[PDB]
Amino acid sequence: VQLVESGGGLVQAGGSLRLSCTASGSTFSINAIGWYRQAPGEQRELVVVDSVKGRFTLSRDNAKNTVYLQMNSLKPDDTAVYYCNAAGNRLYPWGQGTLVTVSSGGGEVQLVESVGGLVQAGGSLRLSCAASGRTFSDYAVAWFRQAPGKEREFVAVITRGGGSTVYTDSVKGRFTISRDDAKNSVYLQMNSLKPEDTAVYYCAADFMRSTLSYRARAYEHWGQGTLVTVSS
């Protein structure tokens, strides 16, 4: 038996994914299969349209020996490595799995992020963020990001007046945060892009003067999210 799971990705909360599983090989591989979910830093558990969800749907295409999990109204809780196997029958050999990462911002002003991009490693890229409802001068503005199969992390922040900037260690040489209060925006210049930089980036703002915080929980205002993809 050669199980292969497919079709995972990095998506936003509220979004949707369809996972597929092709049972193959030189033995029977009966198609009464199910899905298993291993949350990062925990052991595999089972999920099946069964486990307390009006949101997932198990479905089949016998012609293909494929099983399908349609996932709607995704929550950050559904982040995990996803695997098909028996769930009667038992214990086929597990396949590599497929990774599912459901990104989410923390937490008036309406922050809007520029589009981001698909860019090759060691390239550059420039994110921009703009408050639409209000004067952004007054706000401390941070960037957070959420990469595949990781926790949401602090990237960078700039204070009102721009005289204080702080970067997470993994970025110190590469990204620069800055602002043009005249254009009502903040910018993240991203240099020497690397696989680790692929994530959903989030702009976030808070009114200060207070101590300069690096927790998402400290920031009332949050962009929708913008996707950065580094290839090579």
Numbering used by the authors: 2 to 49, 60 to 98, 101 to 120, 128 to 229, 232 to 254
From the paper:
Results: We describe crystal structures of four unique bispecific VHHs that engage and activate the cytokine receptor pairs IL-18Rα/IL-18Rβ and IL-2Rβ/IL-2Rγ. These bispecific VHH molecules, referred to as surrogate cytokine agonists (SCAs), create unique cytokine signals that can be tuned by linker engineering. All four SCAs crystallized in a dimeric conformation where the two linked VHHs interact to form unique antiparallel VHH–VHH interfaces with their complementary determining regions (CDRs) pointing in opposing directions in all structures.
IL-18 SCAs DR3085 and DR3087 both adopt a conformation in which the two VHHs are in an antiparallel orientation with the C-terminal VHH shifted upwards relative to the N-terminal VHH. This offset places the interaction interface towards the VHH C-terminal side and increases the distance between the CDRs. Consistent with the screening data, DR3085 drove the highest maximum IFNγ secretion, followed by DR3097 and 3087 (21%, 15%, and 8% of the IL-18 maximum signal, respectively), while EC50 values ranged from 0.01 nM of DR3097 to 0.7 and 1.8 nM of DR3085 and DR3087, respectively. More importantly, this linker length screen revealed increased activity for one of the three SCAs, DR3087, showcasing tunability of the system through linker-length variation. While DR3087 had maximal activity with a linker length of 4 residues, DR3085 and DR3097 showed the strongest activity in vitro with a linker length of 10 residues, which was the linker length of the initial library screen.
